[PDB]
Nucleic acid binder design. Sequence first.
RNA 1: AAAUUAUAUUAUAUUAUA
RNA 2: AAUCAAAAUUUAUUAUUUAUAUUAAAUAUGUAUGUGUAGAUAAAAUA
Lengths: 41, 18, 23, 35, 38
Amino acid sequence: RELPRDVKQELQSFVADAATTLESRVKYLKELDTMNQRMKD
Amino acid sequence: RWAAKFYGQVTFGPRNYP
Amino acid sequence: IVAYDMRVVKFSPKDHRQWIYCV
Amino acid sequence: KRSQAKLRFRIRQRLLKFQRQLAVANAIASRSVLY
Amino acid sequence: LTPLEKQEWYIDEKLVKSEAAKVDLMNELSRFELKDFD
RNA sequence: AAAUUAUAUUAUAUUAUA
RNA sequence: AAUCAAAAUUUAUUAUUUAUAUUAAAUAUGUAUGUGUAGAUAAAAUA
């Protein structure tokens, strides 16, 4: 039997790396901003 | 799915941008 | 020459090219 | 003319699949997010 | 503009290059990656 | 929901408080 | 293109740190989880 969903999400928030998550999310926001800027012209 | 969480916080003006 | 046309062919979801259709 | 309509349909489907991410990106860019 | 372009058996090559550049703009819009992975 | 990219090993840390 | 001694650079004093080892009481109740810093590198499937 697998784990329930909420303890799995809280454990993924508890034990994962913070710096890699921060860098990937910030570069994802940057890529979305470049897409929006390319759409605006 | 972290970017879909803030969609409930966008003002109704720019919610339909594309 | 009956007709010239510009068709958009799709080779991939990232690759769309344009060819010249001719009748 | 229908092939260009299929291309526009594919572009519209790709844009409406990720409408929330582009909307939150434009909301951060336009400084309009309720904390 | 010209009535020669109104016939379907004659093509304007500059219009072909303009719309092909438009398809390349759609291609460069298709290059992006929008999956969240979070 | 598969292929495994995954290094992995063990130990330590703070004005106890001077 | 118009200069000159920071730690070019050496030495010392109540005093500023981080480290160096010193360094202890305490069961009346309730209790205390990090990032990193390191050495050579010879296990692996909740997405």
